[PDB]
Write a protein that binds this ligand. Structure first.
Ligand SMILES: N[C@@H](CCCC[NH3+])C(=O)O
Length: 235
């Protein structure tokens, strides 16, 4: 007999703790949350590591049906895509070597900044300093961090849980996180869909069900070791 077909879900699995590779498998908070959500939604699915810029290209062509990849909901992105209700709150931070004199975002003036291409961190860097060669763009956040380590850049702007977990997992790298609430906005992550997707409603209801049952907090505690503040998801 005929058919799956499965929902095709894309991701950039180079963004621990949300999605990353471990032993040939894609793991992480977004991975576990997606499984809970799609199961609650009664949707069969496949999760594919397609990379960040390809993910957006493939959503536009509808080769991929859905994405989950630590993606900030933004007004500009809503022009081209649809988002689920938010499932996480985050902010950009600055990642530097210990020893850096940087105390806030404004201290990055005249310095070289590494970011992942087409991210809200690239956006924040361009908003603060204008577009130019001092902003170095990489296809993964992993490579951005590598360019911090080897001195190719002076600082990286990326998401708080990603920077924090990198430092906590890599003490011997002697990096540090600088937070700047005055210069960086609150951000909310959403699952993402091609415009006019018939999956969004099912995913929104499933996410509600996952949060309501305590499954969201079990997953959150697995990855972060503390309770979430669920009231952040109703802002
Ligand atoms: N949350 C930021 C960074 C995500 C990058 C994930 N590879 C954004 O949506 O642009």
């Amino acid at each position: 007999g005929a058919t799956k077909k499965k929902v095709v879900v894309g991701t950039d699995a180079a963004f621990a703790p949300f999605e990353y590779m471990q032993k040939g498998k894609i793991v992480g908070f977004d991975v576990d949350l997606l499984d809970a959500v799609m199961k609650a939604a009664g949707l069969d699915y496949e999760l594919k590591n397609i990379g960040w810029d390809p993910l957006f290209a493939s959503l536009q062509s509808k080769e991929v049906d859905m994405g989950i990849s630590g993606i900030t909901i933004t007004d500009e992105r809503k022009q081209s895509y649809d988002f689920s209700d938010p499932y996480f709150e985050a902010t950009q931070v600055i990642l530097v070597k210990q020893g850096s004199p940087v105390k806030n975002a404004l201290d990055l003036k005249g310095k070289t900044i590494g970011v992942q291409n087409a991210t809200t961190g690239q956006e924040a860097a361009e908003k603060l300093f204008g577009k130019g060669p001092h902003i170095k763009k990489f296809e993964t956040t992993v490579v951005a961090i590598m360019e911090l380590l080897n001195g190719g850049v002076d600082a990286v702007i990326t998401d708080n849980a990603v920077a924090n977990e990198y430092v906590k997992n890599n003490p011997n790298k002697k990096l540090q996180v600088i937070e700047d609430p005055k210069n960086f906005a609150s951000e909310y992550y959403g699952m993402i869909f091609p415009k006019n997707s018939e999956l969004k409603a099912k995913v929104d209801e499933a996410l509600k069900n996952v949060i309501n049952s305590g499954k969201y907090t079990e997953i959150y505690k697995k990855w972060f070791g503390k309770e979430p503040k669920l009231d952040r998801l109703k802002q």
